[PDB]
Subunit: 175 residues, 2 copies
């Protein structure tokens, strides 16, 4: 398994999925599957595309990727017409939280509640607001404790200083 299984969609075109052997995007195997509207449906598609793996849940990727050559159902031509989309990671087996890199002087934090079951977006906001409050930057975050298809009870994240001993601490991503 040289790549993480995941699916990417763009309504109007056939779904794409990560080729776990080489690491490139391929198009829907049957040339018939279009964008999906529910988390339950996305999870099924993941399982249909990766029959050899035990897909047990799904979660949005933290950052968009650029995919080219989207095919259209019916059309012969898959025009290299780039699109920036947020893939869905097909999580496999027993759930384990993402390992996150903690750059020096940054802090690893996490929040959870046994009685809340929210989305990836909600947890992303929590993490962002928590770092923002302390006047810092959100460098990375991951979900914790799944409670449903693409639903979690918490978030683990990394907050970073605007600068260390005078020098600004930067990074680039997601837009």
């Amino acid at each position: 398994l040289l790549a993480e299984p995941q699916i990417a969609m763009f309504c109007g075109r056939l779904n794409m999925h990560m080729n776990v052997q080489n690491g490139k995007w391929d198009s829907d195997p049957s040339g018939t599957k279009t964008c999906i509207d529910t988390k339950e449906g996305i999870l099924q598609y993941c399982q249909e595309v990766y029959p050899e793996l035990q897909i047990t849940n799904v979660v949005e990727a933290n950052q968009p990727v650029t995919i080219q050559n989207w095919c259209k159902r019916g059309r012969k031509q898959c025009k290299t017409h780039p699109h920036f989309v947020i893939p869905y990671r097909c999580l496999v087996g027993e759930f384990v939280s993402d390992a996150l890199l903690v750059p020096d002087k940054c802090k690893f934090l996490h929040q959870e509640r046994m009685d809340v079951c929210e989305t990836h977006l909600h947890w992303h906001t929590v993490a962002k607001e928590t770092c923002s409050e302390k006047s810092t930057n959100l460098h990375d975050y991951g979900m914790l404790l799944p409670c449903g298809i693409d639903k979690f009870r918490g978030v683990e994240f990394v907050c970073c200083p605007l600068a260390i001993e005078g020098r600004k601490l930067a990074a680039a991503l997601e837009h």
Copy 2:
């Protein structure tokens, strides 16, 4: 009802395989934009399963007559405007095998031959059918395979013989 078109694949070396879109009845190119003509039955079978993931394809057999397929594609599917080609499709047989239903038109007869000791090709059986109608001064109108014994291998054939209706001739010579 909500009946689908029989699944099948068509090849033309130097181009991407085509497969029948079972939902609209029209041909589509290779989903991955990389698969090309195959040279083994086992390979044909594997390709069927690949483009028809939701069907239990358990065998393959050549269709009886070639078909005209427009706009083939080259690897990558960036250039697909081309000259139509006459190719003989491969039927992707699903699930449990059952003999095709043959229409016996007026004045024709339905015959079938099965040899439980042999395991021949589609071509062999087509010939056995053609020759059997010839021996009775008739013409082979249609046929289908019987008793599968391997990937695209059968133990028999069912066919329909019909009146020749052909203009013969002789020679007037000195």
